[PDB]
RNA sequence: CACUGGUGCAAAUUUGCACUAGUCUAAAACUCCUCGAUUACAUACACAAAG
RNA sequence: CACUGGUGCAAAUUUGCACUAGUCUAAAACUCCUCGAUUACAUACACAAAGCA
């Protein structure tokens, strides 16, 4: 796969106004740099840049090509060409508008007016981004908040919550004067509040009661849960739609505009997490510190000190524009290879992170030009080889400069001297880093507000939710400064919603330290008794098991030390264990266990996982290994052991195991965790490919409401009646008569007839119950249920469409009788159920053909 | 930038002129031109005399003021390039442009016994002159050695003992001048040179040239040994007769006949220094290179072995590769630069020399014998190419694609590039028998006596001497022997025949190619001799030691005297690092130990050599010499640190190195070596630069004598005249003459009455005192031996120039007469005198491009200010 | 920041500038080979050890 | 193995190919930050211990 050469030239955009034409070069990250103005009728050229600034020199500019070279010696300097945007067969308008043609519409709800440019459009449409993955996100936690319960049929107790009902109003709805049907529904809603607070499962997202019985501090635990889930019902509210077809239009504002108590919760857990963090900073980071200190000869110690928090909370390595993280791996595969040694697994956490501190350093502080070197070189970079050649000579070099502070660190990564640095007084003041420490009060609510929702998610949620996040805040923040600069002057006013996107800049910036502190592990709450059931049942257990029983086996009530090695096994590896969380959360421990018994899934997931890293688990989880044994006989071997898992095999497991008693015990460990990360694996996969429906309907409410304004065929239509009204209307117009705004459609005959017969297979009732499903992720849900028939397992999708048939078709369907009786999901069946999205021909493609899914599968495909 | 004369780039050689005929040429291989056109010059009618597939340009119109044509090869896509005929000049009548000295007519009597009508003679002629002006460079330079050896006190006598020696006496006449028949004048002359020879060999400094005494002290060795030394200084005294003037203005003519017309037993000489050297290479030349021979038979897939041997002798001994019309050491390090940088790193630093050599090996055999049509176009780019940036890109181009071809070979071959690896090579038995070199090893009998002479030469000069000596006369050999090849062509026929003292030119194709051999071989590394007491002695005082040290001290302190295992540490560092160092030889060899140690004390002597050197060199002299660097440090404290270090070392710093150190211990010594390494750079350098800038003096000094000799037989003026008497003469005498009588002869002075006038008044600045202590300085390298004595009076180094003249100043105003005017000033300045310079240089003054670039210190260093103009 | 030829502009006293050449100038003609040069260089890896 | 521009080919037509772009397509603009991912991740070496309605 090559890459774009005027990418790589460093053309990051040529925005077109009414009879102007601005080009952009890259600056440091997303940071555009002004180049050149064009007159889109004579082609006169004035450049913007300075001399130093600029990055690219325009040459010859026509109607239909536009020459430029790069002034750092990408391709040698040599000339690139690129189409003029304005060059378009049949359009009038030099400025293009949006595939879906909602352009004007949507200037108007952003801006308030329609806009003669392309900027205005690019800036909406990174926010309509936004939307589509806080779609994702809440549905994933209001489902996983519902099976919480164990709802058995969906009544949603997330929908009667409302943000605007304070802590007071909602414990006492009937002390209020609000709707007498209002007082009703928070009745419904405070029961299933009550309910979830009974089981104690809020104690896996780090929501943990309090220990005393102190009505004070209960009933401040509780409202702070409460604030919580109102604040997650209110931005599903604002991102999906109600029976009647509305959202709330106050996702941006609310926060500010809610009781201000809802505020002194996010402040208590931002704070929460950011006091401890900074009290005693140097004292909890000596050890490292004092290592660096010694270390960087070349630096005065509180320098060091600032660097290094700033490396822990704000991860200014993370923004250099490349990954350091990969330098080390690459210096470590090559010449640090003794590193690797399982010898310092134990300490392998922190000397990683003085390697990257000494390499961060280097790039931040003792040679800039190097890493700007570096980031030009990347940016120059054509191929996906050709940027890993880069790594690997920079790894060279960085190798020569700190091979010998590798080594050092390397001799101190050992318990003796960690300890010994641990008692060792460190001599320094608490004030060093008071102007580097960052606080609550620093952060905007929006930013607490999304620090708060990363309770619900794991660290890979919070990584996707966080990056998509801060990602377009910082293209919103740059088209603002463009189109606000003096050179391009364009009015740009965000109506009432969005003023809150005149912050984007400082939003980035709070985001991305979200991100850092949300990854942190939660203090553990204490592991309750519910929790061992969910941890039993998932290893295998008795299906009549009482509490009692389980208390006695555990010796729970039992008072002594040493005398709890089993509590402390389940809890240490399957309770604290970040893939049996994510299990719990989203499925069944109970189901789960079954669905562990199929080993077509089984070896399907194991299928994916690399030749080494099967073999690493072979060898740590087989007791008696058969040296010969075949790749496939390893996974089968795997796949067996996960089959026959049982609680009893831990039963007599030894916590202070010594000698070779350490032998059996690491085994446990190795295949629980095996276990746990397969079925991780599969039912993370599956909550996955759902959320790309989850994104198909949201943009779906999202369009009709949209094109509802401008075509009038769709004024007394109800989405919710019928799910394929959007496709079906903008369908018919394209063979009725050249009219239609959708490009989509209009352009492809051929792709606007497939459409058509897709739709006309589909009908209202199973649209509804494929809308239904998708929130709801019933696929997850009965995964158990419907897993088992399946012929044969080669894809998520292939699985996920199957399961999904199943329960659209349950008690007809034209396609029922073939799915039964094929044991595998039928391609027009997914067309057909997908039809609803034709109006969005690429996400109607890549969501029923599943060779077009997944961005990550069929890599060789030319 | 600088841009090359397009007319050159384009391939036109040479326009020659005859009486009635121009002859153009053009460039073929190297040096050789190819007969392109006879144009002639009164009707302008043009005659082809180059094949068609030979031809390099077309010839356009041609008339009394051009010459058109262009490249047939696509120089400028076949552009017309305008040239201006040669023939058309301003109050000439003749076609043929003279010198501008006038001295074509008396030049082309002296090589050829007559006068010609033509310009090609005389371009023959200025390369023999050439030949002569280095040559008397090297001399002056070997003579000064000799007598700084004998620690000589500037008496009277600094031309007895090399001036007294004669070629034409034998050894046994030289040893026992009292059996001689010769005068008594003469022999007592002989013996004031045996004493200073006896005395030369009693120094035991002899070994600083590779000319150590035999071990055995048995006479017949002893006896061979001394009569080996004395037939080279004789030759040296012999050359300096041929190239510089006596008392009288006499001067030798047989400089290029002597050495076959002189007793045999000098040729005997000649033969065993050639010998010793080429048998040493000769012998079991596979075994002693069969690691590298061996990797690349493996590697060479495409290559029969035998072929490969015969290619690597000629790659070591012949270096066929630095004959391709472009670097492959410009190739090979532009390919490391740009892809190789990993083959940079520090880890290859003791394998680099093999590595590089296997390297160019294959970038040899890839232009030598696989691709030559690839080398051929690489050249034509090089010579089409206009600028320094055009060349270094085609070199940058070139590298690319070698790369693409080589990468995986280079890989390979840095594999090999261990320790490990190269014992292994080393111990295994290699089944190649040496005959397969029986028809390719040169032996001392296929060189001619000249070419063996100038080997001899090399015994008493560094490498970078050689280098510059050796390029110099191959040079002028390749141009003298095209110049004689063209002559004696049927398209051009004239005579061209050598007078008898210049037959040797006849063989000058001969020449160049044993002169390239012998500058491969002389710079081969010569065998370590015995470190003696004397170079100890030498060692510990240029490092710093107590002015009352003795012999038994020394002996004492590096345990000489003593017999053992593993208690010679210190004296086997002091002989790898300082007596094996050639930068130490060159200080020993022009200077003193111990003024050379009282110089590196000046810091501002020290930081201006220092300021030299790239920042890059002075970041890693810092890492590696400095025991406690700062990190922030800035270069020019760097350098400040370097520079202290230098006035502080002593040998006591290194009297607890251990040879055998390990760990710590290991990396103070390798700090130590470093150390010692960067003060013998530092101090050489300053050395160094001043004999090269007393070089250009000497070259004046040939020249005026040389010059003179030749306007004596045309200026009647001057008959009674004799240059010792008055320096100025020459200059005074064509001055004045041109005033009055118009004199035309001198074209510089008749030219230009502005520059007349101003060298006039330098004359009248000067006196023929001044200008006489001046030459007799030049000479004996005297700002070199009293550079100790007034460097510390200079305010401000700037130049070796204003170091050279600001000591030369102090020298001729020294006290021993009326004070020069010039000297109040100079005191009181602290720095050389512009003014005085002038007066000085004022002898020069009958050639104003050596008088104005030997005057203006912003005109004299062809590589200083390269930016400004 | 040269010297000399050729060829132009311009100044204006006997000037300069520009372009362009020159193996028949200066350590000095293209490409090499060199030198500047530190980066040395060098038929034998480097150390160590010894003649 | 997409979608849409632009630019070429075409002999084959509602078409096809190649090259090439695209933040105004699709989870989808460079470099990052991420994900794929197993190799988890994580202010405090690891272990043990502390962890019931
Ligand atoms: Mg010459
Ligand atoms: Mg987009």
Redesign the interface.
């Given at each position: 796969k090559k890459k774009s050469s005027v990418k790589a030239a460093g053309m990051k955009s040529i925005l077109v106004s009414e009879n102007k034409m601005y080009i952009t070069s890259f600056g440091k990250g997303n940071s555009a740099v002004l180049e050149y103005e064009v007159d889109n009728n004579d082609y006169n050229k004035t450049q913007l840049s300075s001399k130093d600034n600029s990055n690219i020199e325009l040459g010859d500019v026509n109607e239909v090509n536009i020459t430029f070279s790069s002034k750092h010696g990408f391709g040698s300097g040599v000339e690139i060409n690129t189409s003029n945007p304005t060059h378009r067969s049949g359009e009038s308008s030099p400025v293009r508008g949006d595939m879906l043609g909602l352009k004007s519409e949507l200037e108007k709800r952003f801006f308030g007016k329609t806009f003669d440019d392309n900027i205005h459009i690019q800036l909406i449409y990174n926010i309509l981004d936004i939307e589509k993955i806080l779609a994702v996100y809440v549905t994933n936690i209001v489902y996983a908040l519902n099976n919480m319960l164990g709802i058995k049929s969906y009544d949603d107790f997330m929908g009667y919550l409302s943000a605007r009902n304070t802590y007071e109003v909602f414990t006492h709805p009937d002390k209020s004067n609000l709707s007498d049907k209002v007082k009703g529904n928070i009745k419904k809603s405070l029961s299933k509040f009550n309910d979830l607070l009974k089981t104690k499962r809020l104690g896996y997202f780090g929501l943990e009661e309090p220990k005393t019985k102190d009505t004070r501090a209960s009933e401040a635990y509780k409202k702070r849960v409460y604030h919580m889930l109102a604040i997650v019902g209110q931005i599903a509210q604002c991102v999906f739609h109600d029976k009647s077809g509305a959202k709330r239009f106050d996702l941006y504002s609310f926060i500010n505009n809610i009781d201000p108590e809802y505020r002194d919760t996010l402040d208590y857990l931002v704070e929460e997490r950011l006091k401890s963090i900074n009290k005693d900073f140097i004292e909890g980071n000596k050890v490292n510190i004092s290592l660096l200190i010694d270390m960087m000869?070349?630096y005065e110690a509180d320098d060091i000190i600032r660097l290094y928090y700033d490396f822990i909370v704000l991860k200014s390595q993370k923004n250099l524009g490349f990954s350091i993280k990969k330098l080390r791996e690459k210096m470590l595969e090559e010449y640090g290879f003794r590193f690797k040694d399982k010898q310092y697994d134990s300490v392998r956490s922190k000397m990683y992170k003085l390697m990257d501190f000494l390499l961060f350093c280097n790039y931040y502080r003792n040679d800039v030009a190097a890493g700007e070197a570096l980031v030009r070189k990347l940016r120059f970079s054509m191929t996906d080889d050709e940027k890993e050649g880069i790594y690997a000579?920079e790894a060279?070099?960085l190798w020569?400069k700190f091979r010998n502070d590798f080594e050092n660190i390397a001799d101190h990564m050992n318990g003796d001297v960690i300890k010994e640095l641990g008692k060792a007084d460190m001599d320094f003041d608490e004030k060093i880093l008071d102007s580097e420490k960052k606080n609550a009060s620093d952060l905007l609510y929006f930013s607490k507000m999304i620090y708060m929702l990363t309770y619900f998610l794991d660290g890979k949620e919070i990584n996707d939710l966080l990056t998509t996040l801060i990602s377009k805040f910082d293209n919103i923040k740059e088209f603002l400064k463009i189109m606000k600069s003096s050179a391009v002057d364009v009015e740009c006013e965000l109506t009432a919603g969005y003023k809150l996107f005149n912050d984007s800049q400082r939003i980035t910036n709070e985001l991305f330290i979200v991100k850092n502190i949300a990854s942190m592990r939660k203090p553990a709450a204490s592991a309750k008794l519910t929790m061992f059931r969910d941890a039993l049942t998932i290893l295998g257990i008795d299906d009549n098991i009482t509490d009692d029983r389980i208390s006695e086996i555990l010796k729970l009530k039992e008072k002594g030390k040493g005398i709890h090695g089993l509590r402390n096994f389940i809890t240490n590896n399957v309770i604290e264990s970040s893939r049996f969380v994510y299990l719990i959360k989203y499925a069944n421990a109970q189901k789960i266990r079954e669905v562990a018994k199929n080993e077509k899934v089984v070896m399907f997931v194991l299928g994916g996982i690399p030749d080494t890293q099967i073999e690493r688990y072979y060898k740590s989880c087989v007791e008696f290994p058969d040296m010969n044994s075949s790749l496939e006989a390893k996974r089968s071997e795997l796949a067996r052991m996960i089959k026959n898992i049982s609680f009893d095999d831990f039963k007599n497991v030894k916590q202070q195991a010594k000698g070779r008693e350490n032998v059996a015990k690491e085994r446990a460990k190795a295949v629980i965790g095996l276990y746990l990360t397969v079925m991780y694996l599969l039912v993370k996969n599956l909550v996955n490919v759902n959320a790309r429906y989850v994104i198909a309907i949201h943009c779906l409410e999202r369009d009709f409401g949209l094109y509802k304004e401008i075509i009038p065929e769709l004024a007394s239509k109800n989405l919710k009646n019928d799910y394929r009204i959007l496709s079906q209307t903008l369908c018919e117009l394209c063979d009725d008569r050249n009219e239609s705004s959708n490009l989509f459609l209009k352009k492809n005959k051929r792709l606007r007839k497939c459409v058509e017969v897709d739709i006309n297979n589909a009908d209202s009732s199973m649209t509804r119950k494929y809308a239904n499903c998708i929130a709801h992720l019933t696929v997850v849900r009965e995964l158990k249920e419907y897993i088992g028939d399946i012929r044969t397992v080669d894809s998520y999708f292939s699985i996920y469409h199957y399961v999904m048939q199943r329960c659209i078709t349950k008690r007809k369907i034209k396609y029922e009788d073939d799915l039964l009786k094929n044991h595998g999901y039928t391609k027009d069946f997914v067309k057909a159920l997908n039809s609803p999205f034709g109006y969005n021909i690429p996400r109607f493609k890549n969501l029923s053909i599943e060779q077009l899914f997944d961005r990550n599968e069929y890599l060789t495909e030319k």
């Open positions: 000869k070349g000579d060279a070099k020569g």
